[model samples]
Target: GTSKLKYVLQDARFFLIKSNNHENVSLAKAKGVWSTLPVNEKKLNLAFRSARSVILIFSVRESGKFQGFARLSSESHHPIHWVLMLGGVFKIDWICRRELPFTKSAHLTNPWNEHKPVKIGRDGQEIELECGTQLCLLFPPDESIDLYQVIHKM
Candidate 1:
């Protein structure tokens, strides 16, 4: 008989994310999962039981690029990180991409001015000019150059 009872913290609809200071390579390297990211609060719990995807995204504010794709477990909550600019600090992990998102020729920075940049929009079509501070999440169509390479860190 085919079994169906080995479900222990497996993958989900998609990964989650949050950007910030990537201490060093040994920590952020390029990608994979290796950091503490900030996600929603009640939104996460309800959302975890609600739906999932690469919906919650994160980008390196310093570099101004969407580094890796982070993901939290089934569910958990630490507390609100008002320092990280009002966010819940929790365990996080993610991977890097060779093709880094992109930069905008004439726009950038977020008025909402959260802490990090969570580029939310249809791929191949970025949203904010500058996610925050000096961060951006815009890319052109088939003419952009530059890559964000990352190996399986830790």
Candidate 2:
């Protein structure tokens, strides 16, 4: 038998947004997901402290897109809070259109167009959030896409 350390994890609420406006949730909830530390080493230490973390998914209806995912963790014990911002959204499985995958195709743009780049902080290297501000999902600048394209692209 294998026994390992276990934690009593809790699920945090998620807020989905559209057109830079607050959606079915509060801005505080949105803010909670993007708040990060200044250093990578400390950030990793925080994530390891907690056995579990919080992730929130969102969809942008007005922009014909789905927002990225976000996570919240802690450091110096459970009381301290930190943030981890994920790039791109999850793609739905074509067979049933229900299940989501970890593949890159699981991003906002349909047909996987690389237009807007994700914001990265910390050390300009990946996996680090140093800006200390909430990470936001910015919509594409052009208004070329429509609902029809959004639906069919997915």
Candidate 3:
């Protein structure tokens, strides 16, 4: 029936959104989805994603602050990832949380003197540190973020 078909379509859409996380939001922006939020606020939220995977998670602490995990997929990869601390005001730390089902090797940038890329440990926790360079978080990959621009301008 029509009702059954509608329900099935709705369930599929919900599952896709859940699995892809914010990719739907990004894709919508890419598809010219407009926001009432000011450009600055949108930019900040976009920046938050650009700098990290920006995972939604809770803390191990009693207070249990809800925060985003700034994960880097690769050291030399585009859209350098950084952790924004203190409600996106502070560039305090870059901690990589979250685990992958499949293991892939990548280098962790040593946020210390010499700034070398070291082989990540078995635990696979990437560099976790407070304070990094501004340049690290400045560039947003055109391929990812510019999809919106291309669609919007067209």
Candidate 4:
């Protein structure tokens, strides 16, 4: 029998176009599933602090495309990078189509291509929120995927 390829984590980030149109930001933090490891040593400590506008685009082992992001008060790089380095992975998974952990599909994506902003808090005000392990489904339960094919474009 052919060996089904296991999904190896891949993290790639592309910096977003700045409004001033001067500098092109590269993907600040490109660490993938490893970033989500429970242990501290396995996590990536980014070189920079953060950025104002951040877009984290990532896919794994040819699975599908998914991303997560955070915005800052100003168009600075520190905050965005910091937030991503800490909480971006989970947030991206939160917006993904997978059903919530320990629970059935409360609100899952239909075509897996519909991109929309989700309200996090009860009041419906726009705010920054992160993902929890309980809600994260990094890989399929079967673990038979060839690639995740994740990408992060700001």
The worst-scoring run of ten residues by lDDT in candidate 2 lies at 1-10
Candidate 3 residue-wise lDDT, 74-150, digit = tens: 22211212211112221211221232211121232445324543222211122333212211222221222222222
* Candidate 3 wrongly placed segments (more than 4 Å): 1-116, 130-140, 146-154
lDDT for model 1 comes to 0.34
Candidate lDDT (C-alpha), each: 0.34, 0.27, 0.23, 0.23
TM-score of each: 0.38, 0.21, 0.17, 0.19
Superior by lDDT: candidate 2 or candidate 4:
2
In candidate 1, stretches whose alpha carbon ends up further than 4 angstroms from where it belongs are 1-18, 24-39, 52-55, 77-99, 104-154
At residue 103, give the lDDT of candidate 3. 15
Is 3 or 4 the stronger prediction by TM-score? 4
Residue-level lDDT of model 4, residues 7-57, one tens digit each, is: 111122122111111111113223222122223211222311332122232
lDDT string for model 1 (1-154, tens) is 1011001112233322444454432253332323233334545555557533222345454555555333343354332212233333334443223225544422442333342333442221222323421231222112222122111211
Counting clashing residue pairs in each candidate, in order, gives 9, 3, 1, 39
Among residues 3 or more apart in sequence or in different chains, the pairs in candidate 2 whose N, CA or C atoms overlap within 3 Å are 89-106, 91-106, 122-130
lDDT of 1 at 110: 32
**Residue lDDT tens for model 2, 82-146:** 22233222121111111122232333321111322222111212221211112221222222222
The ten-residue window of minimal lDDT in model 3 covers 11-20
